[PDB]
Design an enzyme around this catalytic site. Structure first.
Site, PDB file in Angstrom:
ATOM      1  N   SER A 191     -10.647   0.438 -10.251  1.00  0.00           N
ATOM      2  CA  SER A 191     -10.273   1.679  -9.609  1.00  0.00           C
ATOM      3  C   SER A 191     -10.564   2.838 -10.546  1.00  0.00           C
ATOM      4  O   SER A 191     -10.579   2.673 -11.762  1.00  0.00           O
ATOM      5  CB  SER A 191      -8.800   1.672  -9.207  1.00  0.00           C
ATOM      6  OG  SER A 191      -7.987   2.187 -10.237  1.00  0.00           O
ATOM      7  N   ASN A 246      -7.574   3.221 -12.938  1.00  0.00           N
ATOM      8  CA  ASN A 246      -6.959   2.167 -13.758  1.00  0.00           C
ATOM      9  C   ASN A 246      -7.390   2.238 -15.226  1.00  0.00           C
ATOM     10  O   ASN A 246      -8.509   1.852 -15.566  1.00  0.00           O
ATOM     11  CB  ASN A 246      -7.304   0.789 -13.183  1.00  0.00           C
ATOM     12  CG  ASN A 246      -6.749  -0.354 -14.017  1.00  0.00           C
ATOM     13  OD1 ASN A 246      -6.144  -0.135 -15.071  1.00  0.00           O
ATOM     14  ND2 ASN A 246      -6.958  -1.588 -13.550  1.00  0.00           N
ATOM     15  N   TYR A 277      -6.888   4.318   1.723  1.00  0.00           N
ATOM     16  CA  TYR A 277      -7.388   3.767   0.473  1.00  0.00           C
ATOM     17  C   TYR A 277      -7.088   2.265   0.398  1.00  0.00           C
ATOM     18  O   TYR A 277      -7.953   1.458   0.058  1.00  0.00           O
ATOM     19  CB  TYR A 277      -6.709   4.510  -0.689  1.00  0.00           C
ATOM     20  CG  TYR A 277      -7.194   4.120  -2.063  1.00  0.00           C
ATOM     21  CD1 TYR A 277      -8.275   4.773  -2.655  1.00  0.00           C
ATOM     22  CD2 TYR A 277      -6.544   3.140  -2.792  1.00  0.00           C
ATOM     23  CE1 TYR A 277      -8.727   4.408  -3.914  1.00  0.00           C
ATOM     24  CE2 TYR A 277      -6.988   2.771  -4.054  1.00  0.00           C
ATOM     25  CZ  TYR A 277      -8.078   3.407  -4.607  1.00  0.00           C
ATOM     26  OH  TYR A 277      -8.508   3.048  -5.869  1.00  0.00           O
ATOM     27  N   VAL A 278      -5.859   1.896   0.729  1.00  0.00           N
ATOM     28  CA  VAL A 278      -5.414   0.521   0.538  1.00  0.00           C
ATOM     29  C   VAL A 278      -6.017  -0.395   1.612  1.00  0.00           C
ATOM     30  O   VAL A 278      -6.470  -1.495   1.301  1.00  0.00           O
ATOM     31  CB  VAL A 278      -3.881   0.417   0.557  1.00  0.00           C
ATOM     32  CG1 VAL A 278      -3.432  -1.027   0.881  1.00  0.00           C
ATOM     33  CG2 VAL A 278      -3.297   0.883  -0.792  1.00  0.00           C
ATOM     34  N   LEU A 279      -6.074   0.081   2.855  1.00  0.00           N
ATOM     35  CA  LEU A 279      -6.719  -0.679   3.927  1.00  0.00           C
ATOM     36  C   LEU A 279      -8.208  -0.938   3.696  1.00  0.00           C
ATOM     37  O   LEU A 279      -8.728  -1.937   4.173  1.00  0.00           O
ATOM     38  CB  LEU A 279      -6.507  -0.020   5.299  1.00  0.00           C
ATOM     39  CG  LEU A 279      -5.052  -0.006   5.770  1.00  0.00           C
ATOM     40  CD1 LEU A 279      -4.935   0.561   7.178  1.00  0.00           C
ATOM     41  CD2 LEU A 279      -4.426  -1.398   5.686  1.00  0.00           C
ATOM     42  N   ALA A 280      -8.906   0.001   3.051  1.00  0.00           N
ATOM     43  CA  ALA A 280     -10.287  -0.231   2.623  1.00  0.00           C
ATOM     44  C   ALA A 280     -10.406  -1.380   1.607  1.00  0.00           C
ATOM     45  O   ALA A 280     -11.416  -2.080   1.577  1.00  0.00           O
ATOM     46  CB  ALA A 280     -10.917   1.068   2.061  1.00  0.00           C
ATOM     47  N   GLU A 281      -9.400  -1.523   0.746  1.00  0.00           N
ATOM     48  CA  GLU A 281      -9.392  -2.539  -0.320  1.00  0.00           C
ATOM     49  C   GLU A 281      -8.960  -3.909   0.195  1.00  0.00           C
ATOM     50  O   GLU A 281      -9.232  -4.938  -0.433  1.00  0.00           O
ATOM     51  CB  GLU A 281      -8.432  -2.113  -1.436  1.00  0.00           C
ATOM     52  CG  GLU A 281      -8.934  -0.928  -2.263  1.00  0.00           C
ATOM     53  CD  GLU A 281      -8.099  -0.703  -3.512  1.00  0.00           C
ATOM     54  OE1 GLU A 281      -6.867  -0.858  -3.436  1.00  0.00           O
ATOM     55  OE2 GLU A 281      -8.671  -0.427  -4.590  1.00  0.00           O
ATOM     56  N   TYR A 326      -6.557  -9.252 -12.093  1.00  0.00           N
ATOM     57  CA  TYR A 326      -5.764  -8.030 -12.067  1.00  0.00           C
ATOM     58  C   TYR A 326      -5.001  -7.840 -13.384  1.00  0.00           C
ATOM     59  O   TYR A 326      -4.653  -8.808 -14.056  1.00  0.00           O
ATOM     60  CB  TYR A 326      -4.808  -8.024 -10.875  1.00  0.00           C
ATOM     61  CG  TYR A 326      -3.686  -9.046 -10.982  1.00  0.00           C
ATOM     62  CD1 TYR A 326      -2.442  -8.687 -11.491  1.00  0.00           C
ATOM     63  CD2 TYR A 326      -3.866 -10.357 -10.538  1.00  0.00           C
ATOM     64  CE1 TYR A 326      -1.404  -9.612 -11.594  1.00  0.00           C
ATOM     65  CE2 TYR A 326      -2.830 -11.309 -10.638  1.00  0.00           C
ATOM     66  CZ  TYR A 326      -1.601 -10.912 -11.154  1.00  0.00           C
ATOM     67  OH  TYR A 326      -0.580 -11.813 -11.297  1.00  0.00           O
TER      68      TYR A 326
END
Length: 211
Positions: A10, A13, A151-155, A175
Site C-alpha cells: 500500500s 504502509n 478502497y477495501v472492496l477493490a482489495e 502481511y
C-alpha cells in the site's frame, strides 16, 4: 517449495522501505515458486478529497506518491536483480482489468452485500484504513468511510481469493502486524476465504533472523 505468495504494497504502509522490501522479496523468492507483487494505486484520491483537498491537489498528490512507490520498488528489484523477472509486479488498477480479478470481484461484492460477518470484517478493515491514513486529517466522516470502503472492496478479491485472482492452487498473503488486513483477519468467527488462501505474518527481525 510453496506455490504462490502475494506481497501487497500500500502507498500507506511504511514497512515498505527499500531495505524491508528487498529482504521480503528475497525471503519469498526462496520459499515460493511464484510471487505476485501488487501495489495499491486505486481509490487513494477519494481519501485525500475526504480530507479536504481539491480534486486537482489530490490527483497531484497521488501521482507523486505513486512515482515515489514505483521508483523505490524498481530500486528494490534491482537490489535482488539478476532474476527480478522471478516476480510479477503489477498495480491493482492493472490487475483489475483481468478476467481473473473480475470473476472474483463479482463474488466479493456479492458477499459484502449478503454476508453479515464478511461485511462487518470489511468494515472493520475500512476503519483501520481510515484511522491510519496518510496526512494531517484527524476526524472521520461519512466521506472517509465511503472512500475507505471503495478502497477495501477493490482489495478484497486479493484477500479473499488469491487462488482465483492469480490462478494458483494456493496463495500466501504476506502481511505485517498492525496493518489494516489484520483488522479483517481478527473479526468474529463460520465464514471462509477460498480454499488454498493463507495469511502469513512477516516480522522483519524474523526475516533477518532467517537470512
Amino acid at each position: 517449495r510453496g506455490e504462490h505468495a502475494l506481497i501487497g504494497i500500500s502507498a500507506g504502509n511504511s514497512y515498505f522501505s527499500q531495505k524491508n522490501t528487498v529482504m521480503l522479496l528475497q525471503w519469498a523468492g526462496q520459499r515460493f515458486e511464484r510471487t505476485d507483487v501488487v501495489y495499491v494505486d486505486t481509490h487513494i484520491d477519494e481519501m485525500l478529497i475526504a480530507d479536504g483537498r481539491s480534486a486537482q491537489e489530490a490527483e497531484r498528490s497521488v501521482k507523486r506518491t505513486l512515482k515515489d512507490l514505483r521508483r523505490r520498488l524498481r530500486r528494490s528489484l534491482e537490489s535482488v536483480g539478476d532474476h527480478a523477472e522471478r516476480f510479477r509486479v503489477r498495480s491493482l488498477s492493472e490487475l483489475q482489468e483481468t478476467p481473473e480479478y473480475r470473476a472474483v470481484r463479482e463474488r466479493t461484492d456479492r458477499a459484502f452485500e449478503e454476508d453479515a460477518e464478511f461485511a462487518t470484517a470489511c468494515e472493520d478493515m475500512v476503519r483501520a484504513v481510515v484511522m491510519n491514513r496518510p496526512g494531517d486529517g484527524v476526524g472521520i466522516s461519512a466521506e472517509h468511510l465511503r472512500a475507505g470502503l471503495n478502497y477495501v472492496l477493490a482489495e478484497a478479491p486479493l484477500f479473499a481469493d488469491s487462488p482465483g485472482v492469480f490462478s494458483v492452487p494456493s496463495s500466501v498473503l504476506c502481511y505485517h502486524i498492525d496493518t489494516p488486513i489484520t483488522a479483517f483477519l481478527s473479526r468474529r468467527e463460520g465464514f471462509r476465504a477460498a480454499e488454498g488462501q493463507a495469511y502469513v505474518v512477516v516480522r522483519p527481525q524474523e526475516l533477518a533472523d532467517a537470512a
